[PDB]
Amino acid sequence: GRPFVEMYSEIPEIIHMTEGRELVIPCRVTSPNITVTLKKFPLDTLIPDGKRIIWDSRKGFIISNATYKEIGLLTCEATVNGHLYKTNYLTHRQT
Amino acid sequence: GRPFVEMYSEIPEIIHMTEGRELVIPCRVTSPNITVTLKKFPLDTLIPDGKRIIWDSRKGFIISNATYKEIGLLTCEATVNGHLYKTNYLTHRQ
Amino acid sequence: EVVKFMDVYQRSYCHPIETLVDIFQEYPDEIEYIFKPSCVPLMRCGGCCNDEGLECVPTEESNITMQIMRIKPHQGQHIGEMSFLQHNKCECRPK
Amino acid sequence: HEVVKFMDVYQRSYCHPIETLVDIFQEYPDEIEYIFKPSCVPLMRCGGCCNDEGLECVPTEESNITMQIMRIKPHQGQHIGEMSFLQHNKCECRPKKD
Numbered sequence: 001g002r003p004f005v006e007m008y009s010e011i012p013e014i015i016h017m018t019e020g021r022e023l024v025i026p027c028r029v030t031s032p033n034i035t036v037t038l039k040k041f042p043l044d045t046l047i048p049d050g051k052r053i054i055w056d057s058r059k060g061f062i063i064s065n066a067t068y069k070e071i072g073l074l075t076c077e078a079t080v081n082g083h084l085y086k087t088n089y090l091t092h093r094q095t
Numbered sequence: 096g097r098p099f100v101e102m103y104s105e106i107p108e109i110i111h112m113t114e115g116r117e118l119v120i121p122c123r124v125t126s127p128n129i130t131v132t133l134k135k136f137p138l139d140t141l142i143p144d145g146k147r148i149i150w151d152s153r154k155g156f157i158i159s160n161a162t163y164k165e166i167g168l169l170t171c172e173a174t175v176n177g178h179l180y181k182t183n184y185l186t187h188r189q
Numbered sequence: 190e191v192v193k194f195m196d197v198y199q200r201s202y203c204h205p206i207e208t209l210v211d212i213f214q215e216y217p218d219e220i221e222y223i224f225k226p227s228c229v230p231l232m233r234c235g236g237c238c239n240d241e242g243l244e245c246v247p248t249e250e251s252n253i254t255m256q257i258m259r260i261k262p263h264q265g266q267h268i269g270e271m272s273f274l275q276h277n278k279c280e281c282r283p284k
Numbered sequence: 285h286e287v288v289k290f291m292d293v294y295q296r297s298y299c300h301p302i303e304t305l306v307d308i309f310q311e312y313p314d315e316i317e318y319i320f321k322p323s324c325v326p327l328m329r330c331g332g333c334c335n336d337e338g339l340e341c342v343p344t345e346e347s348n349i350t351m352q353i354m355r356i357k358p359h360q361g362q363h364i365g366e367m368s369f370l371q372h373n374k375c376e377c378r379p380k381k382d
Contacts, residue, residue, distance in 0.1 A: 010290070010291065011256075011258075011268055041298060042295075068336075071336055071377070072298075073298070088291075093336065105195070106194055106364055107194075163243055166243065201324050226293060227334075230296045235305050254287045254288065256287055270287050
């Protein structure tokens with residue numbers, strides 16, 4: 001069913017970020033063969049390349065050297081058996 | 096078939112006016128018994144009352160002491176033989 | 190395609206339009222928190238009267254309540270339900 | 285329900301192109317000898333928020349639109365002039381500079 005270990009939340013979880021440091025979007029799933037997509041609102045997609053952006057089933061998406069472009073509403077998406085599931089997060093730099 | 100002496104133009108004719116004085120929207124028609132309505136964009140129908148707003152088929156609508164409410168896009172409409180005809184004017188101050 | 194005169198005139202004339210209003214402008218005394226989002230979509234009078242002596246003003250008003258997140262510098266984030274003013278009808282009148 | 289839900293408020297306010305009523309003199313500052321009718325035009329322009337005081341919503345992709353405007357010069361007639369305006373097609377939140 002829902003492949004995400006954590007449950008959906010209507011108000012997005014806040015993630016504190018610091019520019020220039022690692023940023024983790026923690027939408028870990030129950031299996032390495034589930035295909036998960038990462039998007040930034042309104043229309044951007046962040047694709048893992050194994051270097052700057054890494055996907056790890058047990059952790060989520062790991063972005064090195066976060067920048068101002070990663071500040072906003074990020075969403076992980078997965079579809080299991082025709083049903084689309086998601087988890088939303090709001091990244092925020094400390095004042 | 097058109098009842099208005101002046102012909103329809105896609106670009107409204109400009110009418111220079113002054114608040115407090117007489118404003119004439121010149122949509123005169125060809126015969127005295129043609130029914131003509133006056134509209135203000137967006138939400139108004141201007142009703143002749145014989146005193147402040149007067150209809151004269153040989154001249155147009157004559158408005159005594161036009162107010163800021165008359166500054167805008169005004170349209171005369173008439174339906175003759177099932178066809179709706181319109182003439183547009185745009186009033187402009189100084 | 191060139192927009193015809195009558196269409197430009199009708200679409201620009203004084204009327205209620207969706208405007209993105211900054212929350213600080215509406216609540217100038219809420220200075221202890223950072224709001225997310227920092228602005229909200231509201232119907233407000235806008236457009237032109239095509240006469241320098243006239244101005245586009247509201248003639249009927251109402252309220253709308255929206256869920257906003259408030260973050261107190263270093264001390265947590267909470268959802269709040271804030272009320273905002275909208276303009277239902279607009280007219281051109283003397284400055 | 286009686287309140288606009290957070291996700292809706294956020295998605296509807298975030299930096300994006302929106303119809304904006306712009307004064308023609310702001311776009312054609314060198315043509316103040318005329319009075320234009322209408323005096324303002326509807327244009328897609330970047331608007332909304334970036335939700336971070338150090339960022340601003342700016343255009344990253346633009347194009348042009350042409351519209352018929354009535355141009356009035358005191359005691360010269362008035363003529364229709366097609367005038368072009370800049371429209372924003374895509375926006376982004378970038379750091380503010382000084």
